Write a protein that binds this ligand. Structure first.
Ligand SMILES: Nc1ncnc2c1ncn2[C@@H]1O[C@H](COP(=O)(O)OP(=O)(O)OP(O)(O)=S)[C@@H](O)[C@H]1O
Lengths: 398, 282
């Protein structure tokens, strides 16, 4: 029936698709038996080729759907104006599954589970595209929009989607790309320092698109830099140029709604005022506020199990998840003290930013420990004091 | 574009030599003391918030690069265990040098007991006097590409307040801003001046009762210790000066009231008091 599995590779290894495919199939057959992350390989051919094999969201006997990528170490690249005296235009670039973003998919957590939504979005996209929907009969326009409080892992989430679909589309793409021009001329807004540059960017996009053996993620954070609100005030000190900015963006999006392999992901800080078109030129809207207690506790679990995994938490302990702690009947016992304290930590950790959230432990160990010789049961209380100080600096900005 | 070995005696002692307003010694320890903690075990990078990039900004020449240097010093001091030696590098905006420079930096990285440091002056001032563009992007790519090396430490120095573009410091993970130096450091700069002046009877002697000298004497307000109070006087509202204006001050004082080949220091002292009085009537 329905089973789909991923394959992570070592850089210097250079075996072909089919060979590693057969190898991982043989491992799946040898096991034939929740998720699991194959990283320790009896088979030395695997260790020579494969790093990890994961179960991405017990039965095994199903249609083996394997996908073998290779993380690339090239992080930056050139994308700016090239005529003369032009470097700082700063259109950040990436190649597809290149290393930087490994595991970053399952990194984030959102109880709304926009993940699955966003995923089978593009899945069903290609589905229709295969069935050759007569476009103008039933039409959809390649935009996906999110927004919320700043720093909420938004750009992160975009890139995660990119990587994950990537692994889902080596079958259909040799590679792909990622664009991010955001914040460079997204805070200047001068004469065509917006417009002309948008034309240039979508020129570059247009060209870099038509590789049908390549997928395209156009990522535009800071969309609130690309809205004019249609002059909510009759003070057009800088309303005129902004109008044209908006029109450029809309027009480019449209003109490129005719490329089989183009997905655009966009995010914004301000809740409102951000457009009248985009909001209505929006295949899918989304507001992603502060994470609930669930995601907070999950992020806690994650970082804690990592620092265990890093031996930085030296005594490797074990915790209990949300419904796991629900199962113990909230019995305050030996195992449960740390986990229930962590629950109350999340509780008194309400309304924060994933930025600050997965910032916490550094400044915690900083202001409280400054020692690799440290364990849990003190790390929690020190962390809590750190978080209180974090509240106090969030109020220190008034 | 220069070199330093760790604790070797070039800047031996520069550590305490820059007392700052707001514990940043013990604080900024935490930065690397935990950065290397996390850099050891290759923690969930994608998850857990770290880079290896020191960065502050403020009034230029405020012991910032100097604190970076004495910081590499104190880092080896605290942590010669994880690093039986290490290598500090002046990467100069004055500018190929970059290619073999980061090659040498790779050499530095080659060793587990080589506490690498990446010191760059005026990191964003790259866009001040602007074909050094490949210099720019080569340094950038090297930054983002040698971070994964655990013995790497990136010592960035803004030298520009909050006017920093994307490629550099929005990349940062830990930052700090500090205003004018304390009465102590103000005093030390005054001391530099008064030594330059007592170089040739320019202001003519009483050896300068330095800060720790002020402390050891148990505050015996006497012939010279009055400096302290007048120091504090000349540090009372001195909060807000710039190092440029700081060192400019004694010059201007001598300009106003001395008008002479030389006066006894005390006249100059009250003179600079009144000069700063002017300068913060502003
Ligand atoms: N649900 C989450 N799970 C794990 N990490 C999260 C989550 N939400 C946010 N984060 C973290 O928040 C950090 C902030 O990243 P950013 O990309 O700056 O946030 P953002 O969504 O891009 O918003 P901006 O405006 O682009 S900063 C990310 O590096 C994530 O690690």
């Amino acid at each position: 029936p329905t089973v789909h599995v991923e394959v992570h590779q070592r850089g210097s290894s250079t075996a072909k698709k089919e060979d590693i495919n057969l190898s991982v199939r043989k491992l799946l057959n040898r096991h034939n038996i929740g998720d699991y992350t194959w990283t320790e390989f009896d088979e030395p051919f695997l260790t020579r080729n494969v790093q990890s094999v994961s179960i991405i969201d017990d039965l095994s006997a199903c249609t083996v759907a394997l996908h073998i990528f290779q993380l690339n170490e090239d992080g930056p690249s050139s994308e700016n104006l090239e005529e003369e005296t032009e470097n700082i235009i700063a259109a950040n670039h990436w190649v597809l599954p290149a290393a930087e973003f490994h595991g970053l998919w399952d990194s984030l957590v959102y109880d709304v589970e926009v993940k699955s939504h966003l995923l089978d979005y593009v899945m069903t996209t290609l589905l229709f595209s295969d069935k050759n929907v007569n476009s103008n009969l039933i039409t959809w326009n390649r935009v996906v929009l999110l927004h919320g409080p700043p720093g909420t892992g938004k750009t992160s989430l975009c890139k995660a989607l990119a990587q994950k679909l990537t692994i889902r589309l080596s079958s259909r793409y040799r590679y792909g790309q990622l664009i991010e021009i955001n914040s460079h001329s997204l805070f200047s807004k001068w004469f065509s320092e917006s417009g002309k540059l948008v034309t240039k960017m979508f020129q570059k996009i247009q060209d870099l698109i038509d590789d049908k053996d390549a997928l395209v993620f156009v990522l535009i954070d800071q969309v609130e830099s690309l809205t004019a609100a249609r002059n909510a005030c009759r003070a057009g000190t800088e309303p005129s140029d902004a109008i044209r900015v908006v029109n450029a963006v809309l027009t480019q999006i449209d003109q490129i709604k005719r490329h089989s392999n183009v997905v655009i992901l966009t995010t914004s800080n301000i809740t409102e005022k951000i457009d009248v078109a985009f909001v209505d030129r929006a295949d899918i809207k989304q507001y992603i506020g502060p994470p609930s207690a669930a995601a907070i506790f999950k992020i806690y679990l994650s970082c804690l199990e990592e620092l265990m995994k890093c031996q930085i938490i030296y005594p490797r302990q074990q915790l209990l998840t949300l419904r796991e702690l629900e199962m113990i009947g909230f019995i305050e016992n030996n195992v449960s003290k740390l986990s229930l304290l962590l629950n109350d930590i999340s509780r008194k950790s309400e309304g924060l930013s994933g930025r600050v959230l997965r910032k916490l432990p550094f400044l915690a160990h900083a202001l409280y420990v400054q020692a690799p010789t440290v364990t849990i049961e003190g790390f929690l209380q020190a962390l809590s004091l750190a978080v209180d100080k974090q509240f106090e600096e969030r109020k220190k900005l008034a």
